[PDB]
Amino acid sequence: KVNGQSGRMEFFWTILKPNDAINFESNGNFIAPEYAYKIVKKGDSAIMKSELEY
Amino acid sequence: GLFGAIAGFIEGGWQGMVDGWYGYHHSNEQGSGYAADKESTQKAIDGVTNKVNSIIDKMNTQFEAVGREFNNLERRIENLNKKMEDGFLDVWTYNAELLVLMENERTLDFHDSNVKNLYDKVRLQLRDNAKELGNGCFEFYHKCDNECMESIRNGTYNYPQYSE
Numbered sequence: 105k106v107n108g109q110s111g112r113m114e115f116f117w118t119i120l121k122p123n124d125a126i127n128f129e130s131n132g133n134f135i136a137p138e139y140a141y142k143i144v145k146k147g148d149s150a151i152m153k154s155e156l157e158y
Numbered sequence: 159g160l161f162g163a164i165a166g167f168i169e170g171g172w173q174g175m176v177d178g179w180y181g182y183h184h185s186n187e188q189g190s191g192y193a194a195d196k197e198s199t200q201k202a203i204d205g206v207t208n209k210v211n212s213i214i215d216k217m218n219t220q221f222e223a224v225g226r227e228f229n230n231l232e233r234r235i236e237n238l239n240k241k242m243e244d245g246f247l248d249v250w251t252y253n254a255e256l257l258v259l260m261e262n263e264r265t266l267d268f269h270d271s272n273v274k275n276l277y278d279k280v281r282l283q284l285r286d287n288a289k290e291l292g293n294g295c296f297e298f299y300h301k302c303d304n305e306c307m308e309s310i311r312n313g314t315y316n317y318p319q320y321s322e
């Protein structure tokens with residue numbers, strides 16, 4: 105038991121291209137998407153493992 | 159130094175020179191006075207400026223270690239990445255340190271070369287009208303005023319002056 109809960113949720117991700125489609129089908133255990141993210145602005149970035157404040 | 163001028167056959171540097179790394183100190187009946195040999199100082203200033211620019215622009219594509227995250231079962235590829243970035247940073251630190259050291263060496267020896275070359279420039283004009291006092295000075299066997307010294311500075315000393 106982790107956080108007193110034994111069941112485990114495993115999340116997957118993908119990136120839909122423009123003008124394309126995604127198709128889900130299931131009959132159980134479906135943690136369905138309710139929202140998604142449009143990638144509106146690429147660039148140059150990074151992920152910083154730091155502790156400081158802003 | 160490597161050429162023997164600084165801290166060598168010339169004892170030490172003059173506190174009284176402020177406008178050049180090298181220069182003259184003439185003493186005649188018209189007084190004493192320091193003068194800066196500007197041209198040689200400009201050669202040296204160009205040398206150092208180009209050296210600094212070289213140091214800045216020669217390592218302007220060094221290496222940028224961007225962070226990559228890995229899971230618990232990618233220890234091998236994570237260690238590959240880790241020691242790769244570590245090795246690149248080590249080799250570039252090595253390069254920076256070697257450049258700094260070798261340039262300090264060459265620059266100190268360049269200044270020594272310039273002092274010795276100026277002493278030689280004066281001697282090669284003054285060939286027999288003067289005598290070396292052994293520490294950077296030249297005793298004039300004739301009487302010569304401030305324009306004599308100026309002709310020595312800008313390099314046009316006229317050898318026909320009777321000297322006994």
Ligand SMILES: *[C@@H]1O[C@H](CO)[C@@H](O)[C@H](O)[C@H]1NC(C)=O
Pocket residue numbers: 123124125
């Ligand atoms: C998505 O809709 C467009 C109509 O704008 C259609 O042309 C396209 O074929 C659809 N996607 C797929 C995968 O069929």
